[model samples]
Target: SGFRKMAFPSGKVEGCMVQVTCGTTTLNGLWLDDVVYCPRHVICTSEDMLNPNYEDLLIRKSNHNFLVQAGNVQLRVIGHSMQNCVLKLKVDTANPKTPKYKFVRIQPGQTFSVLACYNGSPSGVYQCAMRPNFTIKGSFLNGSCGSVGFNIDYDCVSFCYMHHMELPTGVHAGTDLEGNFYGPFVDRQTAQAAGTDTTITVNVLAWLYAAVINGDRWFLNRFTTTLNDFNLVAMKYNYEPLTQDHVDILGPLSAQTGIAVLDMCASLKELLQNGMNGRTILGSALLEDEFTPFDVVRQCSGVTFQ
Candidate 1:
């Protein structure tokens, strides 16, 4: 028999019977056809096409469904024939920006098997087809294959800062007495006066007092210097630390001025963590509408995005 296009409606092939044979073998030696062949290729086709592959998958071709097949009921086609022929499949998954498709090359001597499972048509129509390169009478079979769908649902939104809650003060300047604070632990006046009497003992005490006061100050100052310096070093290299034009305003300043800037830096960091809600930080607006790459967006995600 000559090759021709055949249409098998999904679920319409139930109770339909067809003969399957090899060579001249029919009854005893031939494979018995199933009573029903449900259209499985429609499983992936729908108002929303997820992914499409033509080589091994089925596609929705408007009203009449098309599939490749072979000649004279033969499962195999001629050798080295399918040249210049491309199997084009299109998949439109609702979103038009990212449509997916595949192209299969039809070569001679190879029998391309289109399985019911390969059809991208929704979950209902599953079928198989074997076609010769550019031929209408290729071989195609419609069969049923299992299919399923899945999705994930969750609530997502840019986070907003909660109401400001005052945290307890920890070791600040006003918390302790003047001497007990990070300062003059031993007074120079007392030490010098005590040093005048019993020269050896007084001198030793004075030395001890100087060492205690100076040593304590050194430790605290070193710590503050290290922390402040570290922050400045980070700001110097980080785009979010300071905007372009803003950097110029603070640049060429003395060390004391630089130290003073630390207060602003700290405030900026806090502002980022607690200020804007659901707003993207624009470097231009952030840097007072200047041209620079430094800008801190609020932590709307409750975590850092940069």
Candidate 2:
């Protein structure tokens, strides 16, 4: 008898998302000693099961394979009945050819964690809670008496969770310069480096942004140089290699400047790799910019030409 309540093709979710405010969301009655329920795991893979409440963040498709688009988010997972937890969170590209990059690979700690950029800062944390169990509750507003409270109760287990949000319109999925696909974090070389315990960051774009933001000059010099394709032309831009001294904004990104040359070239490469099929074909200025001071930047992009 081929019978199933809901054919869960993806598997089980080991993670969950919760947006709590201090003292406000107290886990009192949420925990029941009655019976086992759904939302089994609290932080793992994308398993569309008994989902969460945030109708906006999660876009549940008919099946479990469809990726969920949760704007730029920071998942804060706090496990209570902790035993087996391996939360490897990453950002997937729209380009099927390219692989997703990991931000954090957690082992279910007693403390909290964010799948962020380098330096372990909360600034670069970005993710979505695509789960029947693991969910995304957005940011925690710390109240006067612990204003933004944190706390979660369960019939199956005990846990307290609170997530932070750093949402920006448009750039949530992918930028105009970036590809059009995202959502579905995957590790490209998980099998190759299975035994490696150290957290590795293979995605330089994500790593590069955080490094520049963190103001690590040494890394910028080294990594930017490794960008031979971007740097070869870059070498002609400034008559010198790019460094921290070249930046003038909140971060190390520039407009057709040294840094821009680096990112711009990267943008073109990413665009093609992401299936633009540009294939040396020329398209008009029908494009967008992913940074601030938006209107002005667009002029320098595809929109303007002779």
Candidate 3:
């Protein structure tokens, strides 16, 4: 007989069944007299693969959640939604005239990072919103379109002010080995005291220049000690030190003003050492210019005499 049993490597096949075929020989063992052979391969119909609840299943797994983090002029928005959404951020609500906007499109379970300079303000309020299109519902990861707050360190801000003011262009007086000139007055008081016509800006400039080059260790100690005293007074009062209080504790010669003097001195040394020559200070031209102590304080600390 040409008919033989076909062997399946595996014991069973998915979506398939066993069948047989024979010609001109009547088979009577576990067979029908008019036997019809079924297909060995299964033919799946459209009816078998259709899923009626696919959309419903997707909806069941969908979520509308989000998170936000704000820090150091940077803002981050994260989407925990099961669908794509849009994120919007606004910084510095205090100023309405110049509002800033940052926008990002986020997919399900993704993060969007943004750098928000906050308009150079030390501190301000911010807000974020997340939503889908008009047709779909969405949520605010933080409720009520919540406003968040951010702050920059006061020390950092002061440091920036100090750094900029230390530049030669920022100063209004010059000192050299021969004399000192506040504006254009060349050592007017000393000239008056000595009854001499010669006034020198270079002389004062030279003293400061040499101190910086010599690495005055005592100056550093004095500066740090002044800062420590300032901090202790601040702690005792539990408030920010007023200008008068700073003068009282730090003396009529303010620590900050002294620091400014040292900074200028050091800067002068660097300029001289590097062979860069120009007017070391900027000011009006006058032979007998006034060099008020208050004016020096203002130049160094950016604080008025008051």
Candidate 4:
């Protein structure tokens, strides 16, 4: 493998709040701060299932959906052998008028995802409900319940959020400022584009951070303006009309983002068109320059953000 050694931190802070070190090397004034580790998926085991067990189960509830307070909380259902078990999912908000409920019927072993936001001032409590349909109760009923948690500081910078389908092993859900939300694997097409200097010169990272500061948590919105939104605000530094090309690219755009763009499109469409409500505008924030140092890596190799 030609690999000799790869070392990483193993414990909490020592003398300084942050620390940085290299392989068999040492550095000065570099602190390695602690970051809360959040699991990608909410793994629920049958043994640890919530009380009342399977009947009208409160699958998930949170006081704050915003990353600032509630952190990243997720609920995942597991352990069902039935291929046809229909599970109904729901989310109820404190206010009735501002898009308060979303429902979906999923097959057995499928996971329904949700994000808790700080859109409601001081953040409000949320309750997640799940239940089994009467038709396939006895045939294939084996599953468990579990969840993951993280904390977001109000003063800190912005972050990204995205979801993925849970595999037999589990799903790895995470957020990114510029890179793909699902994970960090480079795209072949994107690589080719890069080869030809085809850079999508938009300050997506800046717009994303700006939106987070203003309380826009639903980055997974319609595909048409996802990229263009960043382009207009960051790169272009102004507003611009979305053209037909933008609309036409939604399909490929969504695919490029590595997210469930179709699902997001349906959800956004329903929220805008139908009387069906359950949508909320989460909180947002601005990036503090004093917090992190920005580095330009275009001219250098073996480089990364600090």
Assess every candidate by TM-score. Answer: 0.14, 0.18, 0.15, 0.17
User: How do the residues 78-111 of candidate 3 rate in per-residue lDDT, one tens digit apiece?
Assistant: 2111111101212222221211221222211111
RMSD of each: 33.4, 21.4, 35.5, 22.3
Q: For residues 1-306, what per-residue lDDT tens digits would candidate 2 score against the true structure?
A: 111111111100112221211111211011112111111122212232124232322232122221222223332222222111111122222212211111222211111212221111122222222121122223332110111111111122112222222123111111000111122211121211111111111122323333333343222232322345644544443222333422333132352334553543355344323533333211212121111222122322323311
Task: Give candidate 1 regions above 4 Å deviation.
Answer: 1-259, 275-306
Q: Which stretches of candidate 3 lie over 4 Å from their true place?
A: 1-254, 257-263, 269-276, 283-290, 298-306
Pitting candidate 3 against candidate 4, the one with the higher TM-score is 4
Compare candidates 1 and 2 on TM-score and give the better one: 2
Q: How much lDDT does each candidate structure score? A: 0.21, 0.23, 0.21, 0.22
lDDT of 3: 0.21
When sorted by lDDT, best at the front, the candidate numbers are 2, 4, 3, 1
In model 4, the runs with Cα more than 4 Å from the true position are 1-155, 162-199, 203-306
Best by lDDT: 2
**Model 2: residue 141 alpha-carbon error in angstroms:** 28
Instruction: Specify the poorest-scoring 10-residue window by lDDT in model 1.
Output: 170-179
lDDT of 4 by residue, 219-279 (tens): 4455433544433442232222333443343434334344433344333333333422444
